[PDB]
């Protein structure tokens, strides 16, 4: 229930060390399905998910040519932004772009995106509803004017509310055995006598998909956040994700604490408690 | 599937 398709582009200048490096990756939900690296020896858009391999040679030739056209453009933008900001020829700079679309539980369109960044800062983006632009400064305003004279905004919507959505669905159905799956988290709790009066409880969640999950603690039924530590969701390396919440409790009172795990694969939320 | 046309900034 609820899906999305996203493309992420990153171009980095290397004055003196040859032409600029270009990397592109494509995701459906939390699964990466495509790759392209300007420095790799293949010079092909490559598959990173199994379901995408059922597409014929037409798709692969078209996506490769489209991603090579994309690199050349970003390569020109690097020289163009350097000029707008009156920057040195020898410094390394970064250009990034993200575009994609969201769909609800019923696969109907919800939101679209097209954002651009220079040196990790917002440069110019299409607004939330897709009908206008947001420029960060005077250089972005210069870009904004070329784009509106070239009627860019109208091209993107057509793609975000149509093509992006049409393919997202095509990918979800053809790869339904691994994209529409829901792997509930394998959970357990560990204990560590930290010292003379302290004790640490660690609540786990391993092998889950999609990455969306909430891990919270409660002391006597009340959200206990004091002396707790929650880590960022991290990838296992096999398509699944991991995460843990830990709390430091007074020695002898650990059964008053409980861990609550919420995830899409769990019909009912799990409540873990320390049982030796 | 990628967007085909991209305008320079």
């Amino acid at each position: 229930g609820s899906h999305s398709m996203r493309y992420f582009f990153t171009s980095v200048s290397r004055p003196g060390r040859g032409e600029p490096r270009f990397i592109a990756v494509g995701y459906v939900d939390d699964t990466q399905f495509v790759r392209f690296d300007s420095d790799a020896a293949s010079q092909r858009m490559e598959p990173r998910a199994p379901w995408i391999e059922q597409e014929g040679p037409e798709y692969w030739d078209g996506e490769t040519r489209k991603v090579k056209a994309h690199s050349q453009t970003h390569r020109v933008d690097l020289g163009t932004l350097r000029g707008y900001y009156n920057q040195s020829e020898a410094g390394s700079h970064t250009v990034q772009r993200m575009y994609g679309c969201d769909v609800g539980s019923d696969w109907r369109f919800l939101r679209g995106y097209h954002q651009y960044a220079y040196d990790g800062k917002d440069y110019i983006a299409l607004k939330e509803d897709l009908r206008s632009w947001t420029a960060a400064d005077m250089a972005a305003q210069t870009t904004k004017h070329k784009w509106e004279a070239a009627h860019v905004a109208e091209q993107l919507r057509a793609y975000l509310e149509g093509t992006c959505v049409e393919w997202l669905r095509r990918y979800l159905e053809n790869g339904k055995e691994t994209l529409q799956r829901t792997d509930a988290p394998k959970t357990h709790m560990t204990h560590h006598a930290v010292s003379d009066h302290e004790a640490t409880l660690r609540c786990w969640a391993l092998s889950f998909y999609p990455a969306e999950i909430t891990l919270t603690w409660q002391r006597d039924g009340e959200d206990q956040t004091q002396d707790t530590e929650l880590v960022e969701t991290r990838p296992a390396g096999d398509g699944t994700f991991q995460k843990w919440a830990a709390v430091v409790v007074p020695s002898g009172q650990e059964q008053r604490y409980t861990c609550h795990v919420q995830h899409e694969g769990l019909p009912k939320p799990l409540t873990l408690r320390w049982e030796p | 599937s990628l967007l085909m046309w991209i305008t320079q900034c």
Epitope: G62, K68, A69, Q72, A150, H151, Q155 | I6, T7
Partner: T-cell receptor, first 115, second 113 residues
């Protein structure tokens, strides 16, 4: 399918001062743009008008074109024709989705405006 | 801002290899070559979407192209043949913006026995 541009009539002879209408149609509506050119014997091609898939009409002096993308057809209008307008008129389109970027030209319309 | 082709005219003997140049200073990602016989349509030879890549058009045989930089897109006849007598047009464009195609003046080649 595959894109196919067609221009009828193939040839066209008229007296000066008349208002001309040239046709250009295409079988695949998924286009990024449409462009009209002019070409005289033993010379290069001069671009006349460019109409993008968003916009539906462009003007340049006595010339004006209109794009009806959805119907797969464009019409070039030439006001008060002159002998200087005698030439071959070509129309072309660029693809929006195929990922090849290859344009598709029509056979062209041969025009001769007599004084 | 323009497309420049050289040479404008050229005579070759059968078997000669010749290179036709084509440059542009507008940062167009797309560059291409056509050949057109007297009173006939334009036919694509080869093309390119950026420095480092190229593609075959309708008639790639007997021709070779390179695209090491964004500014240039040369065309090479490996071994000139009488059948190659034609008018060669180079054409560039952005792969964005209006996508308008810009044609060079044309190069007139006649291959003789």
């Amino acid at each position: 399918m595959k894109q196919e541009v067609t221009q009828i009539p193939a040839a066209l002879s008229v007296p000066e001062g008349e208002n001309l209408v040239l046709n250009c149609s295409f079988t695949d509506s998924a286009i990024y743009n449409l462009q009209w050119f002019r070409q005289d014997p033993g010379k290069g091609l001069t671009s006349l008008l460019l109409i993008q898939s968003s916009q539906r009409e462009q003007t340049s002096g006595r010339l004006n074109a209109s794009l009806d993308k959805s119907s797969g057809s464009s019409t070039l209008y030439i006001a008060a024709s002159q002998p200087g307008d005698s030439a071959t008129y070509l129309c072309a389109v660029r693809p929006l989705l195929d990922g090849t970027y290859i344009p598709t030209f029509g056979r062209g319309t041969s025009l001769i405006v007599h004084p | 801002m323009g497309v420049t082709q050289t040479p404008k005219f050229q005579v070759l003997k059968t078997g000669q290899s010749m290179t036709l140049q084509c440059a542009q200073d507008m940062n167009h990602e797309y560059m291409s070559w056509y050949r057109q016989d007297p009173g006939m349509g334009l036919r694509l030879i080869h093309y390119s979407v950026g420095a480092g890549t190229t593609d075959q058009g309708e008639v790639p045989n007997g021709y070779n192209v390179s695209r090491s930089t964004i500014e240039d897109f040369p065309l090479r006849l490996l071994s000139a043949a009488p059948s190659q007598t034609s008018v060669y047009f180079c054409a560039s464009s952005y792969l964005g913006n209006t996508g308008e195609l810009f044609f060079g003046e044309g190069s007139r080649l006649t291959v003789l026995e």
